[PDB]
Design a protein around this ligand. Structure first.
Ligand SMILES: Nc1nc2c(ncn2[C@@H]2O[C@H](COP(=O)(O)OP(=O)(O)OP(=O)(O)O)[C@@H](O)[C@H]2O)c(=O)[nH]1
Ligand SMILES: Nc1nc2c(ncn2[C@@H]2O[C@H](COP(=O)(O)OP(=O)(O)O)[C@@H](O)[C@H]2O)c(=O)[nH]1
Ligand SMILES: [Ca+2]
Ligand SMILES: [Mg+2]
Ligand SMILES: [Mg+2]
Lengths: 440, 421, 67
């Protein structure tokens, strides 16, 4: 009951899915062949981890996941990789030629050739659910598939699954590791098209994660493997309430009630701690007070923005590991003085706390050290609009000369779709200003 | 995976195309008998982009050799790797174009164009996922210039949703074969503007100047010029031939390099001709450009840079970021993050480190001004027009192609002077 | 109170049904408008090359005029 289906779209979404499902297996004790020796109910059950893993008669625990990419290169690595036995072939869907960094090809030209097959496979996962809760969609903003095909899919999911909840883990583009010059275009187009079809979207700025790896893990030039393993820790913290259970385990939908005050204001800011190397972890243990304090350091945010320049509409602390409420309340009491945390006047100022006792784990051989306690903060701050603003400014620079627009128009799009999408962003920026203004 | 069909037409086309297939077969470890004898699995990961696999695990280049006279293609079949080519892919003419565009585009070439299309159709019909077409030719001759541009248009009719990529050779009086070369080039440039997605401008003036000023020769042969072309053609296709994320196929390269459809003529550059800073600085130097243009006389719309070899990829990021900041005024502001950097751990033969520069600069107008000035000085007197009007052409086709080229230069100047803020 | 309770649940049903309906028709209009647009661009491209072949025929017939 309360199953969640994960959908990984494009290279970024697929490769992040690999990190998450590898980490899930390590957290739950699932082997690469899907066997789970601790699970005494063979062939089924309603344990908390069954929200993400179905069970076969032979005792294999199968991710409730679909991988989709318009090119086979990336998913072929899943097919021949370490966890190849974890998935059935029907969950790994590949095209022939990709969207070539073009939203129009991901949403229209190439996308319409595979959308029905993808929905058919999603439907086969939903039919195995006793009470499907919703979807988690992993994708990039910048890719032609991560943007164009995700928009088409979210639109089709609204039709085939009503207002069933759809959550996003979206990769915000950064020049340090970017693929295409037209990434601002694909980002605005998909944010506009998906806006009314997404209940909640956790953005991840590749530059934020990139700088966290350089600074905290001492990686000269981080790779996608470095970034995705860190990203998987945030995703694990967010879904741990669904996958695990406990007396102080607060469900994510309960946080979601506090995080989304208006339908369009559904982009929470994520901050994770501690991210430390094995060398530093060998020296010092980080307390509840220390990792909580790190949640309000802007260097630990998933998205580059200045929360001091905005106002808070929600603040959630998701703890995992060796953590008890007495420590949390004391640490929050400290933070509520040394740090100035301004709320909008129409919202209560308390912090919502959840604790998952299952200790965090790391991929063996990785760079993240295994710590005894971690925390993920989910806050709704108007400051996250700064990320939209930077992206909108790059869009405006290119669109003023219509640079590269012919690649989109040649695939059937119109200039109106660009201006309509940009206006939605301007209205969203205006929305974030309005919510932060004090009442009369 | 993603197959590219290669076509070479005329003297210059089949010559540089031969060296290209010689170089990359050496890089992928393929002998003249079409057998693999390499050490790295990266040589075969994307080998099918340029090669077919036949009986006995032989790798045959997906190349079609075209010419209106057999003399040039005969020495190709007799040269090294002449056995590696499919003998049926040789399409042979017996008349020649006489270095005349009208003969290549309308008369001699049009009689042979159908037989080329049949061979191209067979290579494309057995492709898992065709990328498009890669042409090597010259613009100053008759076959490669006239029939090449004709072959482009006829292929576009049958594959309108495929990428058309060409390696065009620009004529200069420093290595001039004939005197009517400004006529053939202007007519061909008019065709390349409308029917190709991306064109690498291989300027013989820049080749000779390098083979004279930098590499001291005074008497540079075609082999020394083509040696620069092979290293350049090997560099600009490294992203297509090895496992890479940036500009891995023709359409992604065109999407990231071409901001406006007509402005698709690139400035190739190569270095060296010892360290990552030195390698980066030479790569942007005007004296390392394979086109006779100075980028400090224009603006960069888009740039792609490929570092080959083993080096500090962190030092590469710091050096490519340093040159963008120090030379900020030479990059258009209204295109953010318009310089991409690729790294391939496999160096070319004979070099521990190399760098390949592909720039879309408005300074390319200097090359088009040079060809147009030689055209008008020759067209002001209606010189040698009987070669073309004898083949049925009208003076309208000459004046249009010239008017088309003058519009291209003014389009580059329009975006050179365009600002934001 | 019972009548209002049925009004609320039927309004919730009507809201979800209408959201699905609008989404389904906005998508069908987008895909059809895009398909026609792309076919029009390809048709205009191939027609432009069709003129190239007609002008090439004009050139060959013009040369054919020897006498
Ligand atoms: N964090 C992270 N970002 C990635 C990863 N892979 C790609 N990206 C980002 O995704 C953006 C490019 O989109 P991709 O996901 O690679 O492309 P795609 O979805 O496959 O779309 P097409 O290739 O055009 O068909 C760039 O901003 C990359 O930095 C990844 O593994 N991890
Ligand atoms: N770089 C280079 N240029 C060449 C080569 N062969 C011919 N050219 C140039 O091509 C122009 C003449 O074109 P040509 O090859 O004779 O055309 P074709 O006879 O129709 O094949 C001249 O301006 C030459 O400078 C070559 O092998 N290398
Ligand atoms: Ca069980
Ligand atoms: Mg991709
Ligand atoms: Mg010649």
């Amino acid at each position: 009951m309360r199953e969640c289906i994960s959908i990984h779209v494009g290279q970024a979404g697929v490769q992040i899915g690999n990190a998450c499902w590898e980490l899930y297996c390590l957290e739950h004790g699932i082997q690469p062949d899907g066997q789970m020796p601790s699970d005494k109910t063979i062939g089924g059950g309603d344990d908390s981890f069954n929200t993400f893993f179905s069970e076969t008669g032979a005792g294999k625990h199968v991710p409730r996941a679909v991988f989709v990419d318009l090119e086979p290169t990336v998913i072929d690595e899943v097919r021949t990789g370490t966890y190849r036995q974890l998935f059935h072939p029907e969950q790994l869907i590949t095209g022939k030629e990709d969207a070539a960094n073009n939203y129009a090809r991901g949403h229209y030209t190439i996308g319409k050739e595979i959308i029905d097959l993808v929905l058919d496979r999603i439907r086969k996962l939903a039919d195995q659910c006793t009470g499907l809760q919703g979807f988690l969609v992993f994708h990039s903003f910048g890719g032609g598939t991560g943007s164009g095909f995700t928009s088409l899919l979210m639109e089709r999911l609204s039709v085939d699954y009503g207002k069933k909840s759809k959550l996003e883990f979206s990769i915000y583009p950064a020049p340090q590791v970017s693929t295409a010059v037209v990434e601002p275009y694909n980002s605005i187009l998909t944010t506009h098209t998906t806006l009314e079809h997404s209940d909640c979207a956790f953005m991840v700025d590749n530059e934020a994660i990139y700088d966290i790896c350089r600074r905290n893990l001492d990686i000269e030039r981080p790779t996608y493997t470095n970034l995705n393993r860190l990203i998987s820790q945030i995703v694990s913290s967010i879904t741990a309430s669904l996958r695990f259970d406990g007396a102080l385990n607060v469900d994510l939908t309960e946080f979601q009630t506090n995080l989304v005050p208006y339908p369009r204001i559904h982009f929470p800011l994520a901050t994770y701690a501690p991210v430390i190397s094995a060398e530093k972890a060998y020296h010092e243990q980080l307390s509840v007070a220390e990792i909580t304090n790190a949640c309000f350091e802007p260097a630990n945010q998933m998205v580059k923005c200045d929360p001091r320049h905005g106002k808070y509409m929600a603040c959630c602390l998701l703890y995992r590991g060796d953590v008890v409420p007495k420590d949390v309340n004391a640490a929050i009491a400290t933070i509520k003085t040394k740090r100035s945390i301004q709320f909008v006047d129409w919202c209560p100022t308390g912090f919502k706390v959840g604790i998952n006792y299952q200790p965090p784990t790391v991929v063996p051989g990785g760079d993240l050290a295994k710590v005894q306690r971690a925390v993920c903060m989910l806050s709704n701050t108007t400051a996250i609009a700064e990320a939209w603003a930077r992206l909108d400014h790059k869009f405006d620079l290119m669109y003023a000369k219509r640079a590269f627009v012919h690649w989109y128009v040649g695939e059937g799009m119109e200039e109106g779709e660009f201006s309509e999408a940009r206006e939605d962003m301007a209205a969203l920026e205006k929305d974030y200003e309005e919510v932060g203004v004090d009442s009369v | 995976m993603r197959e590219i069909v290669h076509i070479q037409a005329g003297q210059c086309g089949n010559q540089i195309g031969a060296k290209f297939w010689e170089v990359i077969s050496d890089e992928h470890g393929i002998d003249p008998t079409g057998s693999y004898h390499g050490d790295s699995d990266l040589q075969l990961e994307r080998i099918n982009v340029y090669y077919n696999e036949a009986t006995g695990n032989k790798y045959v280049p997906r190349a079609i050799l075209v010419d209106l006279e057999p003399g040039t293609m005969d020495s190709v079949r007799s040269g090294p790797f002449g056995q590696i080519f499919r003998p049926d892919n040789f399409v042979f003419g017996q008349s020649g174009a006489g270095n005349n565009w009208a003969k290549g585009h309308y008369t001699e070439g049009a009689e042979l164009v159908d037989s080329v299309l049949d061979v191209v159709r067979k290579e494309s019909e057995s492709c898992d996922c065709l990328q498009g077409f890669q042409l090597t030719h010259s613009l100053g001759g008759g076959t490669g210039s006239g029939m090449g541009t004709l072959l482009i248009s006829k292929i576009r009719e049958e594959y309108p949703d495929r990428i058309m990529n060409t390696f065009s050779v620009m004529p200069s009086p420093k290595v001039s074969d004939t005197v009517v070369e400004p006529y053939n080039a202007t007519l061909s440039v008019h065709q390349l503007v409308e029917n190709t997605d991306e064109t690498y401008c291989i300027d013989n003036e820049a080749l000779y100047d390098i083979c004279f000023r930098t590499l001291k020769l005074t008497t540079p042969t075609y082999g020394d010029l083509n040696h620069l072309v092979s290293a350049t053609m090997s560099g600009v296709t490294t992203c297509l031939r090895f496992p890479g994320n940036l500009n891995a196929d023709l359409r992604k390269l065109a999407v990231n390099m071409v901001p406006f459809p007509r402005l698709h003529f690139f400035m190739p550059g190569f270095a060296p001709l010892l360290t990552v800073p030195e390698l980066t600085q030479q790569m942007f130097d005007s004296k390392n450009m394979m086109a006779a243009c100075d980028p400090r006389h224009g603006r960069y719309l888009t740039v792609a840079a490929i570092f080959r070899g083993r080096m500090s990829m962190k030092e590469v990021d710091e050096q490519m970021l340093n040159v963008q900041n120090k030379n900020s005024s030479y990059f258009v502001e209204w295109i953010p993050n318009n310089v991409k950097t690729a790294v391939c751990d496999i160096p070319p033969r004979g070099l521990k480190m190399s760098a390949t520069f592909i720039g879309n600069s408005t300074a390319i107008q200097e090359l088009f001004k040079r060809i147009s000035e030689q055209f008008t000085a020759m067209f002001r007197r209606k010189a040698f027009l009987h070669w073309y009007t004898g083949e049925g052409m009208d003076e309208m086709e000459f004046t249009e192609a010239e008017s088309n080229m003058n519009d291209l230069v003014s389009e580059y100047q329009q975006y050179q002077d365009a600002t934001a803020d | 109170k019972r009548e209002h309770e049925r009004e609320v649940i039927q309004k919730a049903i009507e809201e979800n049904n209408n959201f699905i309906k609008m989404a389904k028709e906005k998508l069908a209009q987008k895909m059809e408008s895009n398909k026609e647009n792309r076919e029009a661009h390809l048709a205009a491209m191939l027609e432009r090359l069709q003129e190239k072949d007609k002008h090439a025929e004009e050139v060959r017939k013009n040369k054919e005029l020897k006498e």
